[PDB]
Amino acid sequence: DDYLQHSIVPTMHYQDSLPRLPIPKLEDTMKRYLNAQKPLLDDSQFRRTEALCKNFETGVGKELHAHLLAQDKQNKHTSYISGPWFDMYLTARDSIVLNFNPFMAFNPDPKSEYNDQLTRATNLTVSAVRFLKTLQAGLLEPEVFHLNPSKSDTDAFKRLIRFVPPSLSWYGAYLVNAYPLDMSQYFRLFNSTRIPRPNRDELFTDTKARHLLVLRKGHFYVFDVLDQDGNIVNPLEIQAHLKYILSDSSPVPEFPVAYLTSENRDVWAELRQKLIFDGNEETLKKVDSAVFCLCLDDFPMKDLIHLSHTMLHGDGTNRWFDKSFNLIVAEDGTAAVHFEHSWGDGVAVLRFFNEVFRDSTQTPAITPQSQPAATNSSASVETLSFNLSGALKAGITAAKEKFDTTVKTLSIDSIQFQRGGKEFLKKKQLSPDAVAQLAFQMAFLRQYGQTVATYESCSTAAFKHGRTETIRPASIFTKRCSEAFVRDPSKHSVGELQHMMAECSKYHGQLTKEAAMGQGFDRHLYALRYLATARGLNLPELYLDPAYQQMNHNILSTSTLNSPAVSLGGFAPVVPDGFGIAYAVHDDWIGCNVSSYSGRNAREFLHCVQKCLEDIFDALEGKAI
Ligand SMILES: COc1ccc(Cl)cc1S(=O)(=O)N1CCc2c(C)cc(C(=O)Nc3ccc(C(=O)O)c(Cl)c3)cc21
Ligand SMILES: CCCCCCCCO[C@@H]1O[C@H](CO)[C@@H](O)[C@H](O)[C@H]1O
């Protein structure tokens, strides 16, 4: 059948009974905010912030909190942060390229020849539509985080829970320490796009569409991957259409339209309207409503730097940046999912990503020896054409100048630390994630002699319409431990550094659990600011404090997702003087892919990260520094 999975439990079985996302006590948000400020502020900056905090907590903040709670109680079908968070993305006017869109790259097919570009593009594409079909059929297994997989993640639990009504099913999984996740974001994974509009962008979906959008040398192509009966088009026919696309010898267009999706959001909103005015609505509707966008690049990868540049931004001609995701397949079979961040988070993309990798490689639709179906692809496949006015052409030239000039200033480099990873760190009773994060704090002290605002993403998908919460890994413990390692290695014994590292780790683990439970401060303070603004009130003095603005000017912006499917990921910094740190602790090694603009140096930082991990592992091994 066309299904990559056959769950006896309906995909959506838990969604009705997911726990509502908790609003913290204002007193706890304030304390947690000040705790994260302690490592960042001089003493008089801190007392200034502490005083604004007390004024907020007793006054306008107390009142905002009261309304947020009452508003939440009116809207128990959703989460307090859902609207504000969507609005955060969609009102933002900056280019989504680099500011927002990340990538995750697949490991190769472990069968060498299956990495042929036509073979791999057909196989990945077909596994992606199989995902779509399985989700549509409610045959995708529900997302569940298990505390005791061996006992709750079992045929036997599944045969029982399927009988509990969705109004109560969450409770059953909870009672066996299993934690179902929100899956509402999968409504926008496919047939979906972000549409630029003034003020606030729009999220568009068209479930009725059956066609694929392919980009090659910046030419646009569509063909059906689902027939009129709802079945997947024969893979050997999909393979012929892809072969046919791969045979076009048209050079890159003089005005590649995809550039426009990299623009400032107001500029692009305006130019899109001109496109409609000049009669391109039908063409745009076909781009917008496609299952996803397949990008076919005609070069192989030179190295991981080249790979990261390619999957993160490319040359601007060959990604439709607005689309829910772009599935990229290069000339050497190197593939990745580049995605737009407003509609959903890493956790939902990861599931899709893991299922497609598994299916495409273990149950491939075609083989590298498959013969394409005899079929007339000039009938099946339409090459789209945009009617470009003089203003549209000038618009595209300007998009291209901005793209090229901004991209030139981006550097990305990586390290593979091979002394150890999870296995050694767990043996030492330390959280591996805390160790990675301490290394980044420590490397930055070494490189710049400062402690800076640090961001780590954490899913709150365990709750109804939960998104992410911010983990703030820069603490008084990472700061004191960094100072000990960098500023006076002499002063401390291996025992003391070991104990210091253990305190970082205990604090990190605490913030982690709190963030996953919705008990960080960032989302809560953001929702109060949002509410004040939406009510038409002046922005409260708390948010005008430079220490607040500084907390949200994230110089160290970090993220990790891990799975056997992912080789590496990448994203740009959020601020011009920042780093964008994609990392993973594996069983045996630690990988970081770091980005920076001109105002920082990724290469030196990785040298400092490398050095810091070696000192960390020595101290843990019993040696001096
Ligand atoms: C053994 O580790 C894992 C096991 C299974 C999985 Cl699915 C993921 C991981 S992990 O590598 O991704 N993991 C390590 C510790 C950790 C922490 C502290 C946070 C997160 C996390 O929530 N990541 C994350 C990062 C970014 C986003 C996003 O939307 O951008 C989202 Cl939803 C989530 C993952 C992980
Ligand atoms: C190792 C895998 C790394 C890729 C992670 C996929 C999700 C990345 O999401 C990224 O998170 C950052 C906040 O931490 C933001 O600054 C970026 O704009 C965003 O793309």
UniProtKB/Swiss-Prot annotation:
Q: What is its EC number?
A: 2.3.1.21
Q: What is its main location?
A: mitochondrion
**Residues annotated as binding (R)-carnitine:** Y455, S457, T468
Provide the catalytic activity annotation: (R)-carnitine + hexadecanoyl-CoA = O-hexadecanoyl-(R)-carnitine + CoA; octanoyl-CoA + (R)-carnitine = O-octanoyl-(R)-carnitine + CoA; decanoyl-CoA + (R)-carnitine = O-decanoyl-(R)-carnitine + CoA; dodecanoyl-CoA + (R)-carnitine = O-dodecanoyl-R-carnitine + CoA
Q: Which domain of life is it from?
A: Eukaryota
Tell me the residue ranges located in the Mitochondrial matrix compartment per UniProt. Answer: 1-147, 178-625
Per the Swiss-Prot or TrEMBL record, the active site comprises H341
Gene Ontology cellular component list: mitochondrial inner membrane; mitochondrion
- Membrane topology according to the record: Peripheral membrane protein
Q: Name one Pfam family in it.
A: Carn_acyltransf
| Intramembrane intervals | 148-177
InterPro entries listed in its UniProt record:
Carn_acyl_trans, Carn_acyl_trans_N, CAT-like_dom_sf, Cho/carn_acyl_trans, Cho/carn_acyl_trans_2
PANTHER family, alphabetically?
Answer: CARNITINE O-ACYLTRANSFERASE, CARNITINE O-PALMITOYLTRANSFERASE 2, MITOCHONDRIAL
* Similarity-based family: Belongs to the carnitine/choline acetyltransferase family.
Biological role: Involved in the intramitochondrial synthesis of acylcarnitines from accumulated acyl-CoA metabolites. Reconverts acylcarnitines back into the respective acyl-CoA esters that can then undergo beta-oxidation, an essential step for the mitochondrial uptake of long-chain fatty acids and their subsequent beta-oxidation in the mitochondrion. Active with medium (C8-C12) and long-chain (C14-C18) acyl-CoA esters.
Identification of the protein by name: Carnitine O-palmitoyltransferase 2, mitochondrial
